[PDB]
Amino acid sequence: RLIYTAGGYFRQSLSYLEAYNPSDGTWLRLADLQVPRSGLAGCVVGGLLYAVGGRNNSPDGNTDSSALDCYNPMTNQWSPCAPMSVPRNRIGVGVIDGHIYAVGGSHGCIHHNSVERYEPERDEWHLVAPMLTRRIGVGVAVLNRLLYAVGGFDGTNRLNSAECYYPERNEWRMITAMNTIRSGAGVCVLHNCIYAAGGYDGQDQLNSVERYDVATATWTFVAPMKHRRSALGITVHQGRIYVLGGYDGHTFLDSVECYDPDTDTWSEVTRMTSGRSGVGVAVTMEPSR
């Protein structure tokens, strides 16, 4: 029931965990991340909210993060998990069958093509087959138990290419590229389509939104957001898409926009308590309190 946003960046990495109630209007302030992190991803397995990778930008210094941390709304408490094999700033993650897949990201000057899988019931990570492409700022979505990695930055070029991970074959296969090159887009799975919203093509922050249909293996341009934004947070709540924050080339946005697929329209629904980009976002049960 609530939209949780963890971490982010507002001229320094942030610790915030805040949850938006799309009915009430309210933002709830919850327990801070142990460590401030930007460029992380969020996901939910078995009701727990996971914060994965990212980077700690502080005045004391900067360090990419391999950390996995788990938040429990019934206790309003964070607990650490076993970390990834490598730090991963600007990671994408997706969940297949109760397992968390960590995709791409960077570590200093290394641009990962590696991919690894977390099993919550054993608190253990294992490497899986690497992507065909090094991708940082990669968008990740799962559609029909397949894991898609969309766009990103390979360290030299930004990418419109997409590829598809078959968990039980353990291999990646290229699929149809998007219309638009995008790093730091919001990618999620609505109904039966993969959406890719915003991002950065190396010249402009983007407001366009496109969506992949597996059946026709085709990307179709849809209604664009109101605000160009890169490094936005994104999630799906009650059959609608929410995008949070991001960076428009000048300001760190607090704008939250909501996409209604039955009307193909975006509208602004709230403002975050403060502008930020690079947050981790996901949906789970509201805190007991």
- Dist. CA 154–CA 183, nearest whole Å: 9
How far is residue 115 from each of residues 32, 45, 64, 131, measured CA to CA in Å? Answer: 28, 18, 16, 7
Spatial separation of the C-alpha atoms in residues 148 and 39, rounded to whole Å: 19
Q: What is the 3-state secondary structure (H, E, C) of the chain?
A: CEEEEECCECCCECCCEEEECCCCCCEEECCCCCCCCECCEEEEECCEEEEECCEEEECCEEEECCCEEEEECCCCEEEECCCCCCCCECCEEEEECCEEEEECCEECCEECCCEEEEECCCCEEEEECCCCCCCECCEEEEECCEEEEECCECCCCECCCEEEEECCCCEEEEECCCCCCCECCEEEEECCEEEEECCECCCCECCCEEEEECCCCEEEEECCCCCCCECCEEEEECCEEEEECCECCCCECCEEEEEECCCCEEEEEEECCCCCECCEEEEECCCCC
Tokens of 218: 């085709």
- What is the C-alpha to C-alpha distance for residues 136 and 92, in angstroms, rounded to an integer? 8
Q: Judge contact between 147 and 138, C-beta under 8 A.
A: no
- Give the C-alpha separation, 249 to 229, whole Å: 8
Nearest in space to 285 (alpha carbons), one of 74, 80, 95:
74
Q: What are residue 256's phi and psi, to 5 degrees?
A: -120, 125
**22 vs 222: CA distance, rounded Å:** 23
Resolution in A: 2.3
Looking at domain 5-284, which CATH architecture does it have?
A: 6 Propeller (2.120)
**In 116-125, which positions are buried (b, 16+ CB within 10 angstroms) versus exposed (e)?**
bbbebeeeeb
The DSSP bridge pattern shows strands 99-103 and 139-143 to be unpaired
C-alpha–C-alpha distance, residues 132 and 255, integer Å: 34
Name the method of structure determination: X-ray
Q: Which among 135, 97, 98 is positioned nearest to 115, based on CA atoms?
A: 135
CA separation for the pair 106, 39 (Å, rounded): 10
